[PDB]
Amino acid sequence: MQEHYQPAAIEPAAQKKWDDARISNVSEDASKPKYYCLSMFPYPSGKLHMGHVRNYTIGDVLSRFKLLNGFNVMQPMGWDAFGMPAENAAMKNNVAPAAWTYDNIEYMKTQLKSLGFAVDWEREVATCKPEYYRWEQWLFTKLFEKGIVYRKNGTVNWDPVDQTVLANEQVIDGRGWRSGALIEKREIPMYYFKITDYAEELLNDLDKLEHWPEQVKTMQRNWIGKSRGMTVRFAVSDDSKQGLEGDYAKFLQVYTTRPDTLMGATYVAVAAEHPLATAAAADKPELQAFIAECKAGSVAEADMATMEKKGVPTGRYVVNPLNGDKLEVWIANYVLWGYGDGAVMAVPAHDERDFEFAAKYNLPKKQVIAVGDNAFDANRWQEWYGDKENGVLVNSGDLDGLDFQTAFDAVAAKLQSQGAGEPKTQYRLRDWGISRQRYWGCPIPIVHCEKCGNVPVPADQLPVVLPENVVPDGMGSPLAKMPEFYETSCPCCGGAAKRETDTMDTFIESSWYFFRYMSPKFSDGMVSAESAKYWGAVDQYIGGIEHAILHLLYARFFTKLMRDEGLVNVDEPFERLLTQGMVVCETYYINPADVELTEKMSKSKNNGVDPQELINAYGADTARLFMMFAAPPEQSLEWSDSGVEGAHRFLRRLWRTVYEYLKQGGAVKAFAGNQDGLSKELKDLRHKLHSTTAKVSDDYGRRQQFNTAIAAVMELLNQYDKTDTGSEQGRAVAQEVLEAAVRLLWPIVPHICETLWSELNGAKLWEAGWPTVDEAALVKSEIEVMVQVNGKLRGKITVAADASKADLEAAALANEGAVKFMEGKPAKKIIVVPGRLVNIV
């Protein structure tokens, strides 16, 4: 064995040994339990960053831990290759997005292989390849036939100067990012997933996820935004029907989640697009200007929660169906057309938004809810005004004295008796718009025929291949200007027709890639039935909480869609979630590596430290160890050159330790079996050993805290250094300690542990398996305790080292000599000195 640690030499050698053994190249082996450990596949931007390193080391630690415990572990890797960053690099360097993407994949793959991740590279996928996206095109056409995917006009942001559609992330102050021209709102036909049909399923199935973080489930619930409220109809007064047609001439319909406060309504508010707003503003210019300012605004919830709530009266009146009061209709900028009825009631006494709105305009505030002892001040807002669990109704006539739910049910029955309302469930969730006016994305498998309409491409003709020899320029998608692409024949009539030129939301590819990993070479479906039945669902998912909402929601939606199609039989894709904290680095006034002598490392400010320089300078094991040791996985990690130095010296210490042990007599059989007769020092070392094994096993398997597991192995080595292991039984225990230490650290730093193991033991490491805990090594020695009766030694008892004072009291009173000297009398007191004596008085 060589004396000094050389990661540049041993890490390539250890990587080829694993590759030649094909331990990571797994199949649907029914003779072993499966474990699917998935890390979020990266966008092939060009180079890895320490964020990738931390994420994929965490996944590799869990994967290698399960492999050592005898699991058939699948840890697949892939490339989220579609999206804008390639389209922006295409216009910068004048290259095709495909060639720019494949150059990055090939390079980033070599960077990943040099880190030693136990990856099944035979299951690699690239989402921009037709062999992949043909199956999301297939699912598109199948759901299109069922109406789950439909075509409908939607609003987009049009740039009149750049001649392109812009996302809201590129529209600032009503203007284009790289143009600055006033952005128009255009209605164009687009495609949507009817995800609202699955809202109740997407909400309730969260209860099945017993191992998800509670805040992630909370974020999913708030995004869906289910509310159980009441539809309420206010009859339009006789004097307020001018110019109103249809149902809008008779009643104003609103939606409310507080029908228990309907007796407290003092006014109602409609959206600027509501027919009551249009009819009232017909001869009032002040209302026409208000409606225009509302339309010329942002429905962005961010801007809406920060905007000044404004309103103007209309002079039109509606009638409350419970108490008969005539209420004036206001046009308000916070009422949104398209959400519910486009109109709401207002209860300023029990809704904070309505209180401030009515405080500005001096509208009445009628209390209809009391919370026991609290006092109601119409000029102040307390937090209990909107209390829904402890409130009780007042000023409600029939409903006085009821709680929220009882008043809810009673108002429901009263409104249905008069035909003026009914219970209604609503969701803030809107349908999922698929269409993107971009080139570098999955083509939409629709053919437009002037005789047949929007026609789906038959399954025999899939995929619709995206042409790769394209250099986008940013002034409109090139597909709309390529007649050789969109000119086609209608698959229903055969006449001249046009292909859809929009591409798909890149969230589509990440919504089902975890299933494609199960059979990435399958050509008869999204995923083969056999591999789907074997792998089931993802056992462990590792990625940012930034994706806790849309990505997870879309992935869960696609899982149920594919299940309903009979492709899979699981309800949820991910059983467990691990969210790693971001990696941060000091900024300088550019990469710190190009600098000589603190925010998230991202492409935005180019703070990302290139892992390849750390690998060349210290090796992959030093990189992996520093990531897992600096902080818990969920906690943020700060880049520290001092941190990578301490990690490398520990690996030098681990190497030096095994070398010095083998220099002093070579390898022997590891100690095992009965440890009676071992010296006290060697028993304590074995106790520390199997205590460390239990602690590392618990930190990998349950807590998923890797920094503490490394610290535990460090403590075991510290006690090893202070232990004389020169004797024959001493050498046997030293062999047992080192054989476990290198296996406990193998998931973190597999390169050095693989090399050290084969110098210690001739068997394959992954066949010796995860170290077991010898429970006998955890039992400490027994102690003899003196028994006293009124201070006189009456006998002795043999006590356990873990015995409580109650155990010594129980054992001291059972002593024969005690009972004989106690003369059948009780003890007014029983003093207990643990580990010395117990005296009964």
Ligand SMILES: Nc1ncnc2c1ncn2[C@@H]1O[C@H](COP(=O)(O)OP(=O)(O)OP(=O)(O)O)[C@@H](O)[C@H]1O
């Ligand atoms: N189109 C709309 N624009 C603005 N506000 C609306 C609109 N439709 C309903 N509202 C108001 O929003 C209130 C709450 O509805 P939402 O769907 O947000 O439920 P919620 O916030 O979960 O309910 P809660 O206020 O009881 O916690 C309703 O009581 C109603 O007054």
Ligand SMILES: Nc1ncnc2c1ncn2[C@@H]1O[C@H](COP(=O)(O)OP(=O)(O)OP(=O)(O)O)[C@@H](O)[C@H]1O
């Ligand atoms: N600085 C970082 N520290 C730790 N993990 C990171 C960091 N940056 C990205 N990751 C993780 O790397 C994985 C791949 O992320 P990816 O390259 O797709 O970017 P992203 O998370 O989508 O970024 P953005 O939100 O800016 O679009 C994810 O699990 C993500 O959480």
Ligand SMILES: [Mg+2]
């Ligand atoms: Mg269960």
Ligand SMILES: [Zn+2]
């Ligand atoms: Zn046709």
